[PDB]
């Protein structure tokens, strides 16, 4: 409102986003998850930020050739490979049996370098009960 303000807490009927514009169903879960203190400036900044949209995520695989002068010519077999990922995040909190994320809907496993792996995140895809479960339990495949 012009030349007016409302308390951040939802305890006044004059708040535009208290009970009229809150709307049910879709917005209820979002409000329960992130019912932080917001105002007109925060809404405007969020709207401005929402105007930038990406396209998708992709992975980049590259390699580097070391110095080929050790034995003779280019007969050496020593090589070094490097990995790179775009639009990725590091997660250290793994849910046990939470139903918030389904199987292959929001979060999916991605290949990682064979330096520091974990089996807890590789089993988030589920889909296995006995056979594939015990197969993935003992041997964790590292991507070639």
């Amino acid at each position: 409102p012009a030349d007016e303000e409302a308390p951040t807490t939802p305890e006044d009927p004059r708040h535009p986003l208290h009970a009229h514009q809150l709307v049910p169903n879709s917005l209820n879960v979002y409000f329960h998850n992130a019912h932080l203190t917001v105002d007109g400036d925060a809404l405007l900044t969020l709207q401005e930020l929402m105007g930038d949209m990406a396209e998708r995520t992709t992975a980049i695989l590259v390699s580097s050739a070391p110095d080929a002068g050790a034995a003779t010519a280019t007969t050496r077999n020593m090589r070094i490979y490097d990995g790179a990922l775009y639009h990725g995040l590091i997660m250290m909190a793994y849910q046990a049996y939470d139903e918030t994320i389904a199987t292959g809907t929001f979060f999916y496993p991605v290949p990682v370098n064979p330096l520091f792996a974990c089996p807890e995140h590789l089993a988030s895809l589920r889909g296995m009960t006995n056979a594939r479960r015990v197969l993935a339990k003992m041997v964790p495949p590292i991507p070639p």
Binding site: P13, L22, P24, V29, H32
Partner: peptide
Amino acid sequence: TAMFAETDPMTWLRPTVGLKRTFNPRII
């Protein structure tokens, strides 16, 4: 309704989230 979301047949446009009962609407 129940807070369970699971999945909905209307996935052509966007998934539909569930509805929770963690609110106490009031006119006044």
